[PDB]
Amino acid sequence: GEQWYEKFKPNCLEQVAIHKRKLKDVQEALDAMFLPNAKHRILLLSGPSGCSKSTVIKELSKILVPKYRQNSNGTSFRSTPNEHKVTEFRGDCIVNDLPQMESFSEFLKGARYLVMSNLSLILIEDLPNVFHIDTRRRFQQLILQWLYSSEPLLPPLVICITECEIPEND
Amino acid sequence: LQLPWVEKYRPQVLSDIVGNKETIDRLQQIAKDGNMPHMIISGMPGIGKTTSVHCLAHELLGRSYADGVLELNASDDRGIDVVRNQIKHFAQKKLHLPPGKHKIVILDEADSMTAGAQQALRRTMELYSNSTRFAFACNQSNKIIEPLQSRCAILRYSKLSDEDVLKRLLQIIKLEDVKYTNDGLEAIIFTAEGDMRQAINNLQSTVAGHGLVNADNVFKIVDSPHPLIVKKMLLASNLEDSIQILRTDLWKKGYSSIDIVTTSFRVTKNLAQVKESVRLEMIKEIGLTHMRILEGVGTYLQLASMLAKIHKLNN
Amino acid sequence: MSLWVDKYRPKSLNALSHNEELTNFLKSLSDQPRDLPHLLLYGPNGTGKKTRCMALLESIFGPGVYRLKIDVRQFVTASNRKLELNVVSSPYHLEITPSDMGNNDRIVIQELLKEVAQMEQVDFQDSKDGLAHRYKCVIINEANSLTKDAQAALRRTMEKYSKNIRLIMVCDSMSPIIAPIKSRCLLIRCPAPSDSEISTILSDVVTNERIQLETKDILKRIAQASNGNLRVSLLMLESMALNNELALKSSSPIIKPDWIIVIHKLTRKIVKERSVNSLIECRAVLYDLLAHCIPANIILKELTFSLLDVETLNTTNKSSIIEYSSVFDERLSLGNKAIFHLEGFIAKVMCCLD
Amino acid sequence: SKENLPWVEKYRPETLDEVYGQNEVITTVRKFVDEGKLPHLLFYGPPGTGKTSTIVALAREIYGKNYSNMVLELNASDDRGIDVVRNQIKDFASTRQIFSKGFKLIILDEADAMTNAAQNALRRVIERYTKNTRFCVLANYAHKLTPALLSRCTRFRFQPLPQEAIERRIANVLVHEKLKLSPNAEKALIELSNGDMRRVLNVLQSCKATLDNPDEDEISDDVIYECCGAPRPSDLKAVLKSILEDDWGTAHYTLNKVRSAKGLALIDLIEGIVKILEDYELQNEETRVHLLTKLADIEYSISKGGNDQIQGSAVIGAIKASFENET
Amino acid sequence: FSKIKLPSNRSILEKLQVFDGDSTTVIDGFAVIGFFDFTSFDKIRKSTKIASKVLFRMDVHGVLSVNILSPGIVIEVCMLEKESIDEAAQTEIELLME
Amino acid sequence: EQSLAQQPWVEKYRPKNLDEVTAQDHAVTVLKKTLKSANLPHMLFYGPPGTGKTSTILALTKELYGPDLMKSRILELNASDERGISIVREKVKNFARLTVSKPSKHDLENYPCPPYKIIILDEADSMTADAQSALRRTMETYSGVTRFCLICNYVTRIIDPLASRCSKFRFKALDASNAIDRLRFISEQENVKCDDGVLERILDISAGDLRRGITLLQSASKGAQYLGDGKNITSTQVEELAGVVPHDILIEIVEKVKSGDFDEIKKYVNTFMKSGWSAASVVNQLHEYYITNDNFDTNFKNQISWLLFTTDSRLNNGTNEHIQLLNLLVKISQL
DNA sequence: GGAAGGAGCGTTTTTTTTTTTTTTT
Ligand SMILES: Nc1ncnc2c1ncn2[C@@H]1O[C@H](COP(=O)(O)OP(=O)(O)OP(O)(O)=S)[C@@H](O)[C@H]1O
Ligand SMILES: Nc1ncnc2c1ncn2[C@@H]1O[C@H](COP(=O)(O)OP(=O)(O)OP(O)(O)=S)[C@@H](O)[C@H]1O
Ligand SMILES: Nc1ncnc2c1ncn2[C@@H]1O[C@H](COP(=O)(O)OP(=O)(O)OP(O)(O)=S)[C@@H](O)[C@H]1O
Ligand SMILES: Nc1ncnc2c1ncn2[C@@H]1O[C@H](COP(=O)(O)OP(=O)(O)OP(O)(O)=S)[C@@H](O)[C@H]1O
Ligand SMILES: Nc1nc2c(ncn2[C@@H]2O[C@H](COP(=O)(O)OP(=O)(O)O)[C@@H](O)[C@H]2O)c(=O)[nH]1
Ligand SMILES: [Mg+2]
Ligand SMILES: [Mg+2]
Ligand SMILES: [Mg+2]
Ligand SMILES: [Mg+2]
């Protein structure tokens, strides 16, 4: 039943299929983003399907988040260290008391809190329904508000966009 | 009542599908093994894609077919909300199946799916691949977005050969006890143009009309594919021969001018003999005549002038 | 103050000073305006067609026709694309330029004009008993630039509501006017003024402005540089007078539109060099011209005739040039993007010269 | 009621026996209904050949006089978008018959006007509910039908009406009316029909009107030409002879006189001349090329209006120049 | 799959009878099942809102008639059923009812 | 009298009844006898501008129903109305399905009142192909209570199925032979005094369009009245009003073309375009001058006929007059 | 000290009618 691309998925950053220079650039940018006062708030990765964007982001997070997360002052949800290095937005989630177009707005409003002892890398791969004009406009507003926010502390935000042509549809 | 032979004789097992011997054999291997991956099945109409996917699902899931298969086609609602709720809930369902067996989502005519739904399908495929597998069926594999193609094994079905069509026709004839002649079966296969559905429909029509499947009886009802007539018209070495073909074989048979010009463009695109300059000039003339027809001047004189220009270019 | 083009504009038929026969015909039309048919004035640009229409209206109604104001009318397309049009109005007539709406001009005909045609204009009688009725006058500027759909929409509006409305359309060429619209109109040809009449008008303006003129020949030259466009003649006269301390002399340069000089330079470049790189630079010049909203067909005319003015070219070269000009003018008329056709014309000329 | 109807509708066939010209198709469909094995049908053909009449007659035969209760008819005048296919057609095809009267019938008249998305949605509706429902698709332009839909339908071609069927229907109409038609008038009517019965019936009705006393007046070829305002064969022959033999001035005068005698239009003269020249035996083929190209250009120009005199002179010059090749 | 069962009491279900498809002979132990699209079934909701009593009558030809009584306003709704019931639906219905 | 003089002559003298329609008897007879037969078919009027199609349909509708009943039995749509596919599928269909209104006793007493309505689609050639397709079964199904009348100038713009459905009526061009009586009647009514042959000249200039001829007659009458000399109108005045180029200018153009010098032709054309002559009229006059001349040979006439046709076709596409005229003259000079 | 391989560049984006999906309603 297991698919090979899942069974033999990389177990470390070195096994990731990525050009060395691109990996170095991404690692430097992400490491800079984690610093106390980082110039860059959003890292936007773009490229074709299956070129290791999300994979390299996850592998890099597995190293960066533990090194930069403040040790908790004896506080945590469960007994385990809460290995939640990457927080991802889920586009198919539907809750009772929230209109669809606002779902992403809610997500970011929580994602802002994942800093310091709750540090986590925010990853956006499954985007909202940007084909809907109003949803796309709201998404752009939220991205701009995150970019222009006056919050002293924010977590790194990574947006992975896979570029592909839309076949003509009747 | 009596079902049409096209549906009455729909293969129910993978061993009754003719053509694409390698692909059908691989599907049989998958059915006996169980490890079905995400797959895309592409090909021209009436060659067995839908039948193949249904037969494979049935063989894989046995009695669990009812609870383990979710089928959706262009006639059902397949928008983004459907992906968000129905497909998601089906993929979340915990179903106890024999080892190596997974739930199957059949998406027939997947090409027509909207962009939002296709993009939403990425996450469900990523999350529920351990228990669910997707079988897309389409005519243009390129109409499925690349992120979805990246997860599936591609399987392209080719046109059926005359041998396979003849074998299936003979099986159907034996089952129905139909009287025929070799020339009649030849005519049916020639008019089918590789489409088994059309072959069966034409055989049934001929049998109903006269019973005995001869060449003359077949050609009384069935017409030779007009693309071949258009090719003959275009390739005639004499202007008068082209005009005669256009008059006798197309115009007086009731073929519309727009159909004639569109078929001429399609055929000229695939003329291997001609040079590139001549081909592109013929395409230009066909396009100009098509423009004239669309404006309302769909007269026989316009088509004759198009033929005259094409002949001039050939010289 | 106002530009001399408008400052000394005649405001009555008796004030017209050129094309006396046209003035007589217009006065004959104004004799009994009760049964005035729809009018279509055609002739070279800048000759005084709009001035003559306003003089005719003044003859029918009075000087109040010159008390103009502007209003903005909003239209919504089937796609909810809101947009606006400028409507000029005087207490007796309206003025519209639907062509400014591009492909949406038809909407203006279907919504605005029709409504204007449908609303019958009545008023209480000052002295007599009962209401009095008066037809409305509507001027359609740039009639030749209307799409075929708008022209078709005009037909039954003109015919059915003839009691309430009378159209006066103005164009520089009747070739783009569909046959039914011409059939529904009285056609009035407006010839351009001769060089002598242009010089007389310019001399009157000079005397009024108290500008010292060395010799009348200058005015003649100005006329010969305007190609019969009186508006251009007056504009250049004003520019030259201002640039020469209100003192014109035989040595004073004649000021021409900048794009005309650019086209002359382009013609010289085309004549001098015929190569691919020359063609790319010609593309750059053409795109610069188009960026200023100069119509493509106007560019083609001016380039064609500037090329035909070259002395070094022979008869065969000029014949080929005019052939290509006609072909690519048709292509522009039937085309969507003008750059293709302008480039094709220039490339064909380069091939024929080389 | 029927008396007030236009003849094109008053003479619509009611039973399959009243449909003429399509003997093969009628034979096959009648046997299919006799055995009750009707498959999904496609009726492809040019205007006024009997497609709609044939399908309605077949529905009447299958369901008798109560066919309107178990037949779902849709045409271009109705919206048939993907939503319509998904809801209305789907529900009709997926529900039982009124009284278990075998299968249901869905007629999609003028289906070439349907959108690609709706046609795509139709595929599985047709396939899954074949046991209970059968589809009929009528069209004049096949290129508007998706390949998947074409693959699913048994195709029948309605040919342009042969002369014999038109003669039989004309005889029926003449008997029904109190009308008398001359053989020459019948030949002219058949020639101008081009295989369309609607034109035959409309011209016949107009000819009956033209008669002062239809009870005793007989329709002649002159009446037909007057009603249609079409040129006579003698006019076309004279014009062509003048063009091919007389000088330019004489040819121009002949064309002007022939046109002005009965107000003939240039397009019909061109069409008749083209018909005449199609049978001409030309020793030089280049002549045919010139004739065809120039005359097609003139026809296209006429289609947009233009100057009539210039177009006529152009026709004369084109024919002369083309026939200079035969020299 | 969900179920709504009407109590077997002479207060809400006044009477129920199965006629074996002839309106005459009463047969016990036989279940009559009618399959409908909710798009059509739900169209009687507003009529039932004012209804005082509702009479259901299903025939063998797949026709269901609902007579609604509210001197008064009387309503009659007739609907056709689907051709056949899928195997999964039949199994689920049997499991729910047994 | 002032109120009656509030209308241009084309609207003033629009035919009131079918008897007033001239030169179109081949269709008028059928339409007239339809009043007694009550067997009106679907109609397709087609023809060149100003031949009497709209007038004929309006007169027929007036004769069939009357001033009052007409309002309930007629639906008129033209190019000034929105006629998209949705309009055809909703408004036109609803009207076609409408029950036939009950005529009053007066209407029945005075008019035949056939038991059907009429939908007039004027300028039908402007409708799209899909919208036209939406009309087919609407016309076929409701022919018992509704009859359609399509009107156009370019019949090729009507899709073939609609043309097959409709009975066709071609309206002929109105020239000096068949329309002179109406123009003479109009001139007599308005007391226009013109020299013999003036009406002939107007009708020849109009080239099949009686509306243009009537407008020209009105313009000439206005000029004569303003002059107030009591003299008859002359053909020269009519030609001047019509925009016809004077014969001397045409002779000058012909001489320049014969000379063959490109520069001289260019200069003369540049000066000639000053007067604002319409290129179509000049091309027509040149065709008349050259085709009928006996001083040129057959090959010259063939070549010039094709050149003139090409130039006229280019002009019909709204091309630029100066360029086309200069090209035509240069080509002719090279023959 | 020869290529062989690779990365980066070469970019911006309304509109006619008509049909369709989506989200909130
Ligand atoms: N050495 C490897 N390097 C990268 N991916 C691998 C490797 N081995 C297996 N895989 C799998 O291949 C897939 C890589 O594809 P992605 O990382 O998703 O690329 P992508 O740029 O994110 O494209 P999309 O937007 O997901 S279609 C992952 O599922 C990995 O688990
Ligand atoms: N290889 C085949 N062998 C036997 N019968 C076939 C075969 N292909 C098509 N048929 C017959 O034609 C009918 C339709 O076959 P399908 O599998 O639906 O073709 P298809 O390729 O799926 O057509 P599309 O892509 O949905 S238009 C079957 O029920 C069979 O009766
Ligand atoms: N085979 C025929 N036999 C007798 N009458 C015919 C025949 N075909 C057409 N007609 C006559 O013409 C009328 C129209 O026939 P239709 O069946 O509607 O033609 P059609 O092929 O459906 O036209 P299209 O494709 O919708 S434009 C009928 O009412 C008949 O009166
Ligand atoms: N046959 C005619 N008899 C009398 N007057 C005519 C005739 N034809 C045209 N006219 C006159 O010209 C005017 C216009 O006639 P119309 O009926 O509108 O012509 P038309 O064919 O409808 O023009 P188009 O196709 O809309 S450009 C009429 O009011 C009449 O004054
Ligand atoms: N003195 C005088 N000036 C005129 C006359 N005719 C036109 N003009 C002026 O010359 C200019 C002509 O431009 P315009 O009226 O727009 O002509 P159009 O573009 O053809 O409509 C205007 O500024 C007028 O004031 C005339 O007869 N006499
Ligand atoms: Mg990934
Ligand atoms: Mg399939
Ligand atoms: Mg039909
Ligand atoms: Mg009209």
Angle (nearest 5°) at CA C48 between C44 and C53: 115
Residue D251 · residue F291 · CB < 8 Å: no
Rounded-to-integer distance, Cα B113 and Cα B133, Å: 18
Alpha-carbon Rg for chain D, nearest whole angstrom, is 25
Q: Looking at the partner chain, which of F8, F274, F321 has a beta carbon nearest the beta carbon of C191?
A: F274
Q: Which atom of ligand 4 is nearest to the CA of C184?
A: 27
- Strands across the sheet containing C93-96: C69-76, C82-90, C93-96, C136-140, C165-171, C39-42, C186-189
Alpha-carbon Rg for chain E, nearest whole angstrom, is 15
Phi and psi at B237, nearest 5°, equal: -75, -10
E strand or H helix at B73: none
Rounded-to-integer distance, Cα C154 and Cα B311, Å: 46
Phi-psi category of residue C211: left, alpha or beta, with phi > 0 → left and psi -120 to 50 → alpha: beta
Phi and psi at A80, nearest 5°, equal: -65, 160
Q: Which CATH class is domain C258-353?
A: mainly alpha
Residue D93 · residue D134 · CB < 8 Å: no
DSSP, residue by residue, C122-158: EEE-SSSSSEEE--EEEEETTGGGS-HHHHHHHHHHH
D322 lines ligand 3 (CB under 6 A): no
Q: Pairing between strand D180-181 and D41-44?
A: unpaired
CA-based nearest residue to C230, from C35, C2, C44: C44
- The CB-side HSE value for D306 (13 A sphere, CA atoms) comes to 28
Per-residue 3-state assignment (H helix, E strand, C coil) for F50-101: CCCHHHHHHHHHHHHCCCCCHHHHEEEECCCCCCCHHHHHHHHHHHHHCCCC
A170 interaction partners in chain D (CB closer than 8 Å) = 115-117, 120
Structure tokens, C338: 């003008």
Torsion of CA A122, A128, A131, A135, to 10 degrees: -100
Instruction: Please tell me the number of the ligand nearest to residue A161's CA.
Output: 1
SS3 B180: strand
Rounded-to-integer distance, Cα B266 and Cα B279, Å: 12
Q: Which CATH class is domain C4-189?
A: alpha beta
Instruction: Establish whether the CB of B114 is closer than 7 Å to any nucleic acid atom in strand G.
Output: yes
Q: How far is the CA of F130 from the C1' of G18 (A)?
A: 10
User: How far does the centroid of ligand 1 lie from the alpha carbon of residue A50, in Å?
Assistant: 5
Residue type, C247: A
Rounded-to-integer distance, Cα B179 and Cα B207, Å: 8
Residue B298 · residue F160 · CB < 8 Å: yes
Residue type, E15: K
Structure tokens, B5: 């032979």
CATH number of C195-248: 1.10.8.60
Q: Per DSSP, what are the bridge partners of residue F74?
A: F118
CA-based nearest residue to C155, from F122, F60, F61, F217: F122
CA-based nearest residue to F111, from F54, F72, F67, F144: F67
Q: Pairing between strand E74-80 and E63-69?
A: antiparallel
Q: Pairing between strand A121-124 and A86-88?
A: parallel
DSSP structural state of residue C194? P
Tell me how far the alpha carbon of residue F333 is from its chain's centroid: 35
Q: Looking at the partner chain, which of D95, D98, D99 has a beta carbon nearest the beta carbon of E83?
A: D95
Instruction: Establish whether the CB of A52 is closer than 7 Å to any nucleic acid atom in strand G.
Output: no
Sign of the dihedral defined by the CA atoms of residues D7, D12, D17, D23, in that order: positive
- The CB-side HSE value for C348 (13 A sphere, CA atoms) comes to 18
SS3 A166: coil
Contacts of D294 (CB under 8 A, 6+ apart): D314, D318, D321, D322, F306
**What is the b/e burial string over B73-96, where b = at least 16 CB atoms within 10 angstroms of the residue's CB?**
bbbeebebebbbeebbebbeeeee
Instruction: Please tell me the number of the ligand nearest to residue F215's CA.
Output: 4
Angle (nearest 5°) at CA F26 between F20 and F31: 65
**Judging by beta carbons within 10 Å of its beta carbon (0-12, 13-18, 19+), is residue F102 exposed, middle or buried?**
exposed
Contacts of F17 (CB under 8 A, 6+ apart): F59, F62, F63
DSSP, residue by residue, C263-299: HHHHHHHHHH--SHHHHHHHHHHHHHHHHTT--HHHH
Rounded-to-integer distance, Cα F236 and Cα F198, Å: 9
Resolution in A: 2.1
Domain ranges of chain C: 4-189, 195-248, 258-353
Rounded-to-integer distance, Cα F66 and Cα F60, Å: 10
Residue type, A159: I
Residue D298 · residue D314 · CB < 8 Å: yes
Structure tokens, C27: 């006065």
Structure tokens, C61: 């109604």
Angle (nearest 5°) at CA B206 between B202 and B212: 135
Q: Which atom of ligand 4 is nearest to the CA of F153?
A: 25
Rounded-to-integer distance, Cα F288 and Cα F292, Å: 6
D2 CA: distance to closest CA in chain B (Å): 31
Contact E80 D95 (CB under 8 A): yes
Q: How far is the CA of A18 from the C1' of G4 (A)?
A: 19
SS3 B153: strand
Alpha-carbon Rg for chain F, nearest whole angstrom, is 25
- The CB-side HSE value for C351 (13 A sphere, CA atoms) comes to 8
Instruction: Establish whether the CB of C77 is closer than 7 Å to any nucleic acid atom in strand G.
Output: yes
Structure tokens, D283: 């020793």
Restricting to B residues 44-63, those with a Cβ less than 8 Å away from any Cβ of A are none
Pure H helices in chain C = 4-7, 20-31, 49-60, 105-108, 114-118, 148-160, 179-183, 195-209, 217-226, 230-243, 258-272, 276-291, 296-308, 315-334, 338-353
Phi-psi category of residue B11: left, alpha or beta, with phi > 0 → left and psi -120 to 50 → alpha: beta
Domain ranges of chain B: 1-160, 161-224, 225-315
DSSP structural state of residue B160? P
Angle (nearest 5°) at CA C90 between C88 and C91: 140
Contacts of F150 (CB under 8 A, 6+ apart): F42, F43, F44, F45, F121, F124, F158, F162, F166
Residue C182 · residue C40 · CB < 8 Å: yes
Sign of the dihedral defined by the CA atoms of residues C91, C94, C100, C102, in that order: positive
Tell me how far the alpha carbon of residue A103 is from its chain's centroid: 16
Residue B249 · residue B262 · CB < 8 Å: no
Phi and psi at D70, nearest 5°, equal: -130, 20
Residue F317 · residue F272 · CB < 8 Å: no
For a pocket test of ligand 1, which of A3, A4, A6, A9 has the largest count of ligand atoms closer than 8 A to its C-beta? Answer: A9
CA-based nearest residue to F327, from C327, D45, C339: C327
**Judging by beta carbons within 10 Å of its beta carbon (0-12, 13-18, 19+), is residue F197 exposed, middle or buried?**
exposed
Residue A47 · residue A163 · CB < 8 Å: yes
Sign of the dihedral defined by the CA atoms of residues F321, F323, F327, F329, in that order: positive
Instruction: Establish whether the CB of A21 is closer than 7 Å to any nucleic acid atom in strand G.
Output: yes
Rounded-to-integer distance, Cα F19 and Cα F60, Å: 10
Residue type, C105: D
CA-based nearest residue to D282, from B303, F299, F190, B240: B240
Alpha-carbon Rg for chain A, nearest whole angstrom, is 17
Torsion of CA F186, F190, F193, F198, to 10 degrees: -30
The response to whether D220 counts as a known ligand-binding position is no
Phi and psi at D114, nearest 5°, equal: -80, 150
DSSP, residue by residue, D50-114: SHHHHHHHHHHHHHGGGGGGSEEEE-TTS---HHHIIIIIHHHHTB--SS--S-EEEEETTGGGS
Sign of the dihedral defined by the CA atoms of residues C313, C318, C320, C326, in that order: positive
Sign of the dihedral defined by the CA atoms of residues E32, E38, E39, E44, in that order: positive
Structure tokens, C162: 């003839």
**Cα→Cα distances F213→C152, D253, F45, F47, F187, Å:** 21, 24, 22, 17, 11
F213 CA: distance to closest CA in chain D (Å): 17
**What is the b/e burial string over D262-275, where b = at least 16 CB atoms within 10 angstroms of the residue's CB?**
ebbbbbbbbbbbbe
E strand or H helix at C313: none
Alpha-carbon Rg for chain C, nearest whole angstrom, is 23
Q: Find where tokens 């594919």 sit.
A: B225
Chain A residues 68-97, Cβ below 7 A from strand G: none
